[PDB]
Design a protein around this ligand. Sequence first.
Ligand code: B12
Ligand SMILES: N[C@@H](CCS)C(=O)O
Ligand SMILES: [K+]
Ligand SMILES: [Zn+2]
Ligand SMILES: [Zn+2]
Length: 862
Amino acid sequence: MVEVHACSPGCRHHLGGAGWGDAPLVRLGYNKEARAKKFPYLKALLERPLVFDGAMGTELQKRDLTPEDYGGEAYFGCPEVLNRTRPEVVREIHLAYLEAGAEVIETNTAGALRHVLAEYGLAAAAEELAFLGARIAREAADPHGAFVAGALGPGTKLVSLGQISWDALYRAYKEAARGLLKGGVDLILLETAQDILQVRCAVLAVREAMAEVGREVPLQVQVTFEATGTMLVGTDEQAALAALESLPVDVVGMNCATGPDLMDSKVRYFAEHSTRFVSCLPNADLTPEELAKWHLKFVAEYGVNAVGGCCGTGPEHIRKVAEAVKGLAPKPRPESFPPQVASLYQAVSLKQEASLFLVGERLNATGSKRFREMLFARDLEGILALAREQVEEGAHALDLSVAWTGRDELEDLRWLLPHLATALTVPVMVDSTSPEAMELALKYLPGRVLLNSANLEDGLERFDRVASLAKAHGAALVVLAIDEKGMAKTREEKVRVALRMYERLTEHHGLRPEDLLFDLLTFPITQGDEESRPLAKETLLAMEELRERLPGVGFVLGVSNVSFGLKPRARRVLNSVFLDEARKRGLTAAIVDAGKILPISQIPEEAYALALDLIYDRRKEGFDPLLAFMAYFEAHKEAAAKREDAFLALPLLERLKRRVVEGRKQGLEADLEEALKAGHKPLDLINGPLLAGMKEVGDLFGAGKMQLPFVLQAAEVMKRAVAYLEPHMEKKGEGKGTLVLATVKGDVHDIGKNLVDIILSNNGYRVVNLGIKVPIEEILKAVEAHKPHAVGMSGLLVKSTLVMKENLEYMRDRGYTLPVILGGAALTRSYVEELRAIYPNVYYAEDAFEGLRLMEELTGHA
Ligand code: B12
Ligand SMILES: N[C@@H](CCS)C(=O)O
Ligand SMILES: [K+]
Ligand SMILES: [Zn+2]
Ligand SMILES: [Zn+2]
């Protein structure tokens, strides 16, 4: 092995593993075959479904156990102290589960954690009671030749919410896992997880336990989804899986809180998308027979790898499940997972559909006077509004740098990060030259973070420290083309540094290409020195080359830099054109603000061609592009005022259209008022100038001539106009029936939907509008509560047409035959015709009027 000898003193491979051998993640993905060859539990998961045991706690509660059984009054009701004071009772329950057909039992150790046990005066006994728990299970399982799972639960204190420090929590999982490993468990099971940051904390602590003890075992991680649909601290299934896929874990799954019914969408999401094996352990009430049917569905139809029960399930539940699942062939797991990052709340794709991945930069002390002022003044409320402003303008993630000469970086992160952890809906790109700052940040930020910058500026060791940190915490990584020779300025230097960095991150450390965002630099081309004139072109040509040579990797640029030195209008224009040029060369992400760009649709053809000449350095004895480009803005200084007066001069109707296209909120309501006073009706304005404006924005976005922030600015105008016009809308009928209406899970588009709501409401239909990103469970809760004549689902993403199909499947499975009306721009009539195969009663609606006519037909025209 070359690689075993090629470590620096910066490498920390115990937690994340390296790029070779048995590490959980390597360049090629989840290291399934190697780990199946080393570990009998994973071999078994490949070969057959593994039946878990059922509840321990609810089994213990059925024994009439006295204070004496627990060692005294102090310890009464602590399950884990029974490992010392009534071992034979814990064992008997294992024996009942094995005799019922369980091939995997869990240790009575879920609450064998320092801070949980402190309740009973047992804080110092966590390792002991965990070790005795593993021994009890070993004693029962060894005659049966079964597996033992060392079970650790979430504890009583939520780390994302500040109720315990990462370090105290880390120490609690470590010592506990140590007990389990020394006791002979075959795998460690982190279960009933409520806090996605705890998952990261405990995974890394349990890994460290393995390294300390010299014994590695598979790691299985199960979250709990509450009846509301998320983990307790607010994490959905998508964000959960995104946060798990990049960690050193073998098996992902869920347990507790609900029965399999509510669990079904979440189990199907894991079964469908995870590269790891998948487990499912529902709570119960639920009969043995019912649970056996749900696990037959989950195994045979979805490909779930291990099945058992949680709280309320007994031996009898496991008996029926083992009979139901014996002899089913496992389905193969998916081999790739789309690159995604995550906040506490939501997953975000790194390959954004039809768009760059846009990273706001205003939370950067170096680049932002406002943020700096608010940081030093400890203005939390101001920083969160700034965060929100950026997300509102389309930021998929936020770059954060607090570093400032004169200040303690670590103090400022300790102040700010606890608040960002729970406030942000989007992920954080942690921006720092200090690995210590990075490591501190990774103790506070839930989900899958980004790290802004592995580079070779300060030696291989720092590079390896950052690389190691990213591998262990499952972070995406920005790779910056700077080495011992300095910043790479030419295409040749950029490719060479990128290739060296790539090979080290993939082959040595085991990061996937998909985790990497290569930053070839952005230098100013405005200063006007002959050195600086080709520096933009060099980045663009390097990026194209590295795109063909490195499939899978991403590219990110801080684009504003290109234009440093210029006047604001010139900057906005150069930044925008550079960004589009970079997109055409392979760019996947951009660190940029909305204010520092404008739509290409708004750039005169002459400014456009001059910006091209400057970027590509089209210099002649004829003409110097920098001077020509500067001179353009000198000679069109009045341009802002010709725009404003020409805008204000337009006819009323065309002016309404223009407000949409150009995002002009200011004076909107006055124009709409003017139109209502002249006798125009609300729906005329909506269907006419306003939606014509949205049609044009769509054409420009689809043609690459308008970026996401300006589509959001058009969207805001559109929704303000509809909200102003809605109260003036003429009603046209009386109680004709009821529609439950929703945009489906994953989708935030609602302009279509809300027009539907308004047209139907005013033609005399009760519309229960459930909003955006509505899961099928909440749709059907609404169906049950309101008993409507139909259900409406809106979908504008291609992805949403697949959610609609699955929604129809979910509805068929639970007996629904109510009419379903599907609509949205992504969805065709030919496609809804085909869904009739799943669900007879499904109808397509081209528009709100077609929706109206379908409600008319389906209620007898009421
Ligand atoms: C506005 C807009 C946005 C706004 C939406 C704001 C809001 N709605 O609150 C914002 C900026 C939020 C947005 C974001 C994104 N969007 Co967008 N967006 C658009 C845009 C420009 C206009 C959509 C619109 O409002 N149309 C106006 C309404 C009136 O039309 P409509 O919704 O079709 O509805 C009519 C019919 O379809 C029907 N209908 C619709 N629903 C229903 C339901 C029922 C029951 C009935 C009876 C009828 C019915 O009736 C309506 C009126 O007659 C479209 C352009 C397009 N569609 O080609 C892209 C578009 C839909 N978006 C797109 C994309 C990709 C995205 C993003 C992924 C961008 C990104 N960030 O990477 C995100 C995804 C966010 C998410 N969903 O999770 C794509 C989707 C295609 C795809 N491959 O997935 C489009 C097509 C652009 C493109 N690529 O060309 N988007
Ligand atoms: N393994 C635990 C789960 C706690 S919710 C038990 O069955 O009691
Ligand atoms: K169990
Ligand atoms: Zn190493
Ligand atoms: Zn439970």
